[PDB]
Amino acid sequence: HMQGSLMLDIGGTWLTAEDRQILRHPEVGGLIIFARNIEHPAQVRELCAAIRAIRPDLLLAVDQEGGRVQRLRQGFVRLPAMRAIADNPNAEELAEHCGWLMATEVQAVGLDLSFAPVLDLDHQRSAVVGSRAFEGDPERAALLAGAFIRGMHAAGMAATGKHFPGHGWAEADSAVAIPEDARSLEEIRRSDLVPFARLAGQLDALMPAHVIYPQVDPQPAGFSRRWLQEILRGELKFDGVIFSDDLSMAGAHVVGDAASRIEAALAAGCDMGLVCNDRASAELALAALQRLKVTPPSRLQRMRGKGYANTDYRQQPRWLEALSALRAAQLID
Numbered sequence: 400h401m402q403g404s405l406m407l408d409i410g411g412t413w414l415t416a417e418d419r420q421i422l423r424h425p426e427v428g429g430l431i432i433f434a435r436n437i438e439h440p441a442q443v444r445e446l447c448a449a450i451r452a453i454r455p456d457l458l459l460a461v462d463q464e465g466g467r468v469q470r471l472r473q474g475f476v477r478l479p480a481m482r483a484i485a486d487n488p489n490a491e492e493l494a495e496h497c498g499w500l501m502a503t504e505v506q507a508v509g510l511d512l513s514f515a516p517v518l519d520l521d522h523q524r525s526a527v528v529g530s531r532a533f534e535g536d537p538e539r540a541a542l543l544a545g546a547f548i549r550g551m552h553a554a555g556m557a558a559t560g561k562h563f564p565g566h567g568w569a570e571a572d573s574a575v576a577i578p579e580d581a582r583s584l585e586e587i588r589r590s591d592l593v594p595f596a597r598l599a600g601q602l603d604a605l606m607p608a609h610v611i612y613p614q615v616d617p618q619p620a621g622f623s624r625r626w627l628q629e630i631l632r633g634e635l636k637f638d639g640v641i642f643s644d645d646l647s648m649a650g651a652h653v654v655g656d657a658a659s660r661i662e663a664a665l666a667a668g669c670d671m672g673l674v675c676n677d678r679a680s681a682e683l684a685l686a687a688l689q690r691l692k693v694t695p696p697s698r699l700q701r702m703r704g705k706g707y708a709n710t711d712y713r714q715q716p717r718w719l720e721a722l723s724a725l726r727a728a729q730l731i732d
């Protein structure tokens with residue numbers, strides 16, 4: 400039988416009775432949290448614990464990269480944007496401290512993974528990449544990123560590189576338009592695809608971009624068996640998990656109904672479909688996974704973080720080194 404899984408979201412600070420009923424379905428493999436869910440660190444710990452009271456095995460995720468994408472804000476250290484870490488004499492050291500601190504904190508409120516870091520290159524072109532990108536030079540970005548990942552891992556967290564093959568060049572937004580990248584496969588392999596390649600080893604999961612690369616595949620990357628099977632698994636040698644990008648955005652609407660979107664997405668090789676912000680679409684997706692009788696991909700458990708979810712991380716020395724280290728660069732407060 401086919402494999403696959405599904406990442407939901409809720410709309411409140413605590414679980415409504417529908418949220419609990421739907422969490423009980425095994426086809427569901429994770430939940431993602433946004434600003435609207437997050438009130439205080441304690442509140443997030445309670446929410447994680449209430450979710451795990453129902454499904455201890457569910458992956459809990461957040462978009463916490465620092466900079467202008469940081470959901471966990473009050474009670475947490477404000478982590479810089481990756482561009483800010485880019486320009487420092489010791490940016491590799493500051494990147495390791497960033498990833499480890501970010502991940503120790505995100506895990507310290509009972510989450511498993513963040514989707515970090517962004518391996519997209521800043522060409523000063525895409526609206527959505529902006530300061531999130533580590534650099535514009537592929538090898539510099541990738542060295543930096545790789546160190547960020549070393550930190551996450553040191554803290555116990557599985558690292559998730561987004562967005563394959565690269566959102567840097569497409570000058571449209573994936574949430575509203577359908578972004579297109581007309582570059583050749585060799586020009587992508589030479590620029591934007593470099594960090595995925597270099598980090599394919601050290602990455603545990605990847606998220607495809609909803610950009611279309613018509614010189615490679617007519618369909619968007621997350622729907623593309625050429626992008627996901629031939630170039631990624633067979634070529635880049637990637638063995639981790641493939642989280643689809645959010646299937647409620649416009650970059651995903653090329654296929655059709657949300658059930659159809661998750662069919663394309665898992666049939667292309669994604670291990671986990673992300674449906675956010677629409678409960679209706681998430682329930683139609685879920686119906687489709689029920690019908691297909693999916694089983695969770697075996698590798699998903701590899702995303703669950705190994706760090707203790709307590710307040711005891713403050714008394715580790717690596718916490719003081721990271722704090723001092725980061726304060727000196729003027730990244731942290």
Ligand SMILES: CC(=O)N[C@H]1CN[C@H](CO)[C@@H](O)[C@@H]1O
Pocket residue numbers: 431462514527561562566573574644645675
């Ligand atoms: C292209 C982009 O920025 N995608 C984001 C959309 N929202 C997802 C769920 O929050 C994120 O994981 C992606 O980074």
